[PDB]
Amino acid sequence: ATFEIVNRCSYTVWAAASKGDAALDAGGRQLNSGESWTINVEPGTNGGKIWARTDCYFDDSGSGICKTGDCGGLLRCKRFGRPPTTLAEFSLNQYGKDYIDISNIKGFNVPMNFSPTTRGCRGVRCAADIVGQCPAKLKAPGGGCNDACTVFQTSEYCCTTGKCGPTEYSRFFKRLCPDAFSYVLDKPTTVTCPGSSNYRVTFCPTA
């Protein structure tokens, strides 16, 4: 119900929180190095995601653009962010439980730790330097490292028929970040927590 979004990176980022068809709390906010943003997420939200955006520019009305994770050019996101985007995923109060995970299925742009601040479970993280190690063909000019489905648009990478296996590209993300989904059908890396737990999403955790 309460998430703290901390930016431990030495660079500014524009946090974002959405569930695809609506914002979570204010949906987005500028987050300078060291600043923390506290938001409230309604119990039961399904398919919620938190992520960071880099190199953004917003006018007074709140309209603009970012190089990674841009959401329809809005400061306060309603829709999901545009790849590459390391994703903090969660579905709350699902059958008495809470479910969280980190995903690289949509690429990686910023290192991240996702941990409960209440008891009953553990957190997950993906802090390796994926952007610096990013394969030549996946590097995104705007910054970040694209997932292979975003770059090649193939049934295999996008797991279109719900029938797909790991790939050299998915193995890259998996190699650097074991505890994060590297592709749609990756062995679940989801964590189960008590219903209504509180959480903290830290960007650049080992920074």
Curated annotation (Swiss-Prot):
Could you tell me which cysteines form disulfide bridges?
A: 9-204, 56-66, 71-77, 121-193, 126-177, 134-145, 149-158, 159-164
- Asked if Disulfide bond is a keyword of the record, the answer is yes
- Subcellular localization(s) per the UniProt record: Cytoplasmic vesicle
- List, alphabetically, the Pfam families matched: Thaumatin
Q: Which CDD domains match?
A: TLP-P (cd09217)
A GO cellular component entry from the record: cytoplasmic vesicle
SMART domains linked? THN
Q: Where on the tree of life does the source sit, at the highest rank?
A: Eukaryota
Going by the UniProt record, its keywords in alphabetical order are: Cytoplasmic vesicle, Disulfide bond, Signal, Taste-modifying protein
Q: Which family does it belong to?
A: Belongs to the thaumatin family.
Q: What does this protein do?
A: Taste-modifying protein; intensely sweet-tasting. It is 100000 times sweeter than sucrose on a molar basis.
Q: What is this protein called?
A: Thaumatin I
> Which organism is this entry from?
Thaumatococcus daniellii
